[PDB]
Design a protein around this ligand. Structure first.
Ligand SMILES: C[C@]12CC[C@H](O)C[C@H]1CC[C@@H]1[C@@H]2CC[C@]2(C)[C@@H](c3ccc(=O)oc3)CC[C@]12O
Ligand SMILES: O=c1ccn([C@@H]2O[C@H](COP(=O)(O)OP(=O)(O)O)[C@@H](O)[C@H]2O)c(=O)[nH]1
Length: 439
């Protein structure tokens, strides 16, 4: 005689709340996909202005007001609005009868105040970092070593535990934001203000990729490396168009070019890249967002070209990046080195030409070229066509490039192993799921 009680994923409710930008939404969506496939009930909370985006990419979906002035006011409003918004949702779900009450809130690492919403309403908090471990620990040391730089007087090289030496150009780039550099800096530093009170510290990376620094952070804070959250081999826009075009190219013949969802290049920088791509011995697929089309050399959603070299080019406002990168036609990836684009390239075996723009993109580029050895970084600040030309020859037409390709194929296998049964990332994500079930 008695009652047995069963705690299983299908009666466990996970809340997820990304920062409303595609580089933060996308990795969180993939993680929600993996968690739902384990049987969990997953509710994704997102701002109204990103809601339609996420709806088209798909899991229960909740919208909250955008919550929005200069950078500082814009952001204090944002933090205040989403605090009460998300708190309301937790409480509606705690009294609801359909879904189970929330057990945990997975929130973006850049919204650390959400840990206080989670704990203030009696549920657990998991902080999802969308940056690699290596650059993240740079933010921690900065929050805690002199990082000022009078780059005009002398060159400095910084040594930190479990990191390669970092030149000034390898540190995170904040001066780009000029007046707002301090704001962007504090946003990334403050990720660590409560690192000791977080119930789960989640990183979208895999241990073999960052083993030295992952271990150092595992010792300090017991982090969980659970990446890549994207699947091995999201409904994005223009899928059929780009897949048909790529299906019509020769294998290993296409340079894929994209600077992500936020970065905006000067008109002179666009002219340089343009002139390189139209004279290279390769086809190209170049994503230029609608908002950036007017900065192209003197607006249609896409344009087709026969290049001066007799090759074929496609300029298009958006593509399915993961599908593009895994297409056999792609020879290499000219990228701003956002972490999602970097980790997607790694998981796809595609070598890179690094054109980093700001924040962690400079550090990622350093690791792409000198640590993982799967790409080369351009040298500035304007990057001229001849410099872009040099990097294409090196990646795509050289013995060194064949080696870079070999290195990328190795890392592709290692990230597949990480997310497969018994891999470090599969194990860490199962640690997260299983301990959510504990009494
Ligand atoms: C958070 C952010 C992306 C991820 C990483 O932490 C680096 C950050 C860079 C700065 C921040 C971006 C996000 C968009 C901005 C708010 C967006 C912006 C700028 C001005 C404004 O009024 O509203 C939004 C453009 C860039 C942005 O300011
Ligand atoms: O044409 C494109 C360009 C980018 N992305 C996606 O945009 C996301 C985030 O980009 P990233 O982190 O590299 O840099 P950001 O856009 O934040 O600057 C990635 O998941 C990419 O797959 C896409 O789907 N199609």
């Amino acid at each position: 005689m008695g009652t047995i009680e069963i705690s299983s994923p299908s009666k466990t409710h996970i809340l997820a709340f990304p920062f409303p930008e595609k580089g933060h939404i996308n990795p969180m969506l993939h993680l929600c996909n993996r968690l739902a496939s384990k049987g969990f009930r997953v509710t994704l909370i997102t701002t109204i202005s990103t809601y339609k985006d996420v709806k088209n990419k798909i899991i229960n979906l909740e919208s909250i007001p955008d919550g929005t002035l200069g950078m500082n006011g814009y952001f204090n409003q944002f933090k205040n609005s989403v605090t009460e918004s998300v708190a309301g949702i937790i409480e509606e779900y705690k009294l609801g009868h359909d879904f189970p009450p929330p057990k945990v809130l997975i929130y973006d690492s850049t919204m650390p105040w959400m840990l206080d919403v989670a704990h203030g309403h009696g549920i657990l908090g998991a902080s999802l970092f969308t940056q690699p471990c290596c650059v993240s620990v740079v933010y921690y040391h900065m929050l805690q070593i002199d990082f000022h730089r009078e780059q005009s007087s002398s060159s400095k090289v910084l040594l930190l535990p479990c990191l390669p030496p970092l030149e000034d150009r390898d540190l995170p780039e904040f001066d780009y934001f000029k007046e707002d550099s301090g704001f962007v800096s504090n946003l990334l530093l403050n990720q660590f203000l409560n690192i000791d009170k977080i119930d789960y510290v989640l990183f979208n990376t895999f241990e073999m990729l960052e083993s030295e620094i992952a271990n150092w952070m595992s010792n300090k804070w017991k982090i969980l490396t659970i990446g890549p959250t994207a699947p091995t081999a999201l409904f994005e826009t223009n899928t059929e168009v780009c897949m048909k075009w790529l299906d019509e190219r020769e294998p290993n013949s296409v340079i894929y070019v994209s600077f992500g969802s936020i970065a905006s290049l000067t008109e002179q920088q666009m002219e340089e890249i343009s002139q390189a791509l139209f004279t290279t011995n390769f086809n190209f697929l170049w994503v230029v967002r609608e908002e950036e089309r007017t900065k192209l050399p003197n607006n249609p959603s896409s344009e087709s070209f026969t290049t001066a070299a007799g090759k074929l080019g496609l300029i298009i406002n958006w593509c399915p990046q993961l599908d593009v990168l895994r297409h056999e036609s792609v020879a290499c990836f000219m990228t701003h080195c956002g972490w999602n684009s970097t980790l997607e390239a790694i998981s796809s075996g595609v070598p890179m030409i690094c054109v980093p723009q700001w924040v962690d993109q400079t550090t990622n580029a350093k690791f792409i070229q000198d640590v993982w050895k799967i790409g080369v970084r351009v040298n500035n600040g304007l990057v001229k066509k001849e410099e872009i030309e040099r990097c294409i020859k090196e990646v795509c037409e050289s013995e060194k490039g064949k080696e870079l390709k070999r290195n990328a194929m190795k890392w592709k296998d290692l990230s597949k192993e990480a997310v497969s049964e018994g891999g470090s990332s599969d194990t860490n994500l199962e640690y997260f799921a299983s301990t959510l079930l504990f009494y």
